[model samples]
Target: THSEREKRVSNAVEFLLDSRVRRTPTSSKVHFLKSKGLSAEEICEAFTKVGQPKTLNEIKRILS
Candidate 1:
C-alpha cells in the first residue's frame, strides 16, 4: 500500500509539472499550488493522503 501510494503521488506530482498538453485551468492549478507554499513533496503527499483534487482551490482546501 505504501509503495502504491508513493507511486500514485509521484505520478500526480509529475502531472503537475508536465506542461506539454496545455490547459488553462490545470496550468493555474499548478501555479496556485506553487504559490501556496506547497512543495512538490507536499503536493504528492496531499494527493496520496487526501484525494485527487478537482480544482486548484479544491486541493488547496484539502491540503490546508
Candidate 2:
C-alpha cells in the first residue's frame, strides 16, 4: 500500500519539523525513519514530490 508507505514516509517528514520530543526534531525523524528502514532515497522521492523543496538533498547528506 502506497498509503502505508507514504504515511511512514509522512511520519519522517512531519517529525522533522515538529515532533513532541523537545531536544531535537531533525534527529528524531532520522532515527525513527532509519528504524523504519526506509531509504533516504524513498523519503526523498515523497518529500520532493510533495513540493517541500529539494530537501531530499538535505536528507541525502545526513542519511548518506
Candidate 3:
C-alpha cells in the first residue's frame, strides 16, 4: 500500500517536472501538483516536506 502511494506520488512529481511551468522551482512544483489535482494546501505541504532545491537544480535534476 505504501509502495502504491509512492508510485502515485512519484508519478505526480514526474508529471510536474515534465510540464511547462514558469516562475520559481517552488512555484512550479505548486503549479504542477495543482495540475495533478492536488489542493492548494496539499501543494504547500508537499513543497515544505521535500528538500528539493529552490533553484534550477530541481529543473535540471528532474529533466535530466
Candidate 4:
C-alpha cells in the first residue's frame, strides 16, 4: 500500500529537485505530474519530505 503510494510521492519530490523543474518556466511540470495520476496528498507529502522547497509557490499552486 505504502510502497505504491510512496513510490509516486518519492518520485515527484526527486523530479522537483531535478534540473527539469529548474529549466521549465511553469505549469507544465504540474500538468505532467498531476496528469500522471499523482494526487494532492502524494504531492503534499512530497513537499513535506522535501523540506527545502525550491518551488514553494508550486506547493500552494498544487492546492488549486
Candidate number with greatest TM-score: 4
Instruction: Name the runs in model 1 displaced over 4 angstroms.
Output: 21-23, 26-57, 60-64
Residue 39 deviation, candidate 3, in Å?
A: 0.5
The 0-to-1 C-alpha lDDT of every candidate, in the order given, reads 0.53, 0.61, 0.50, 0.67
Please write out the lDDT profile of model 2 over residues 1-64, one tens digit for every residue. Answer: 5687777776766654553543555544555666787687766664565454447668777775
Q: Give the TM-score of candidate 3.
A: 0.40
The better-scoring model by lDDT among 1 and 4 is 4
Tens digits of lDDT, candidate 1, 1-64: 5675455455556665455523446446545555665655556465454344454465555445
Q: What residue pairs clash in candidate 4, if any at all?
A: none
TM-score of each: 0.35, 0.46, 0.40, 0.60
Give lDDT tens digits, candidate 4, residues 1-64: 5688778987888887787675774466666667767875566666567664335466557547
Model 3 bad stretches (over 4 Å): 2-24, 52-64
TM-score order, best first, reads: 4, 2, 3, 1
Count residue pairs with overlapping backbones in model 1. Answer: 0
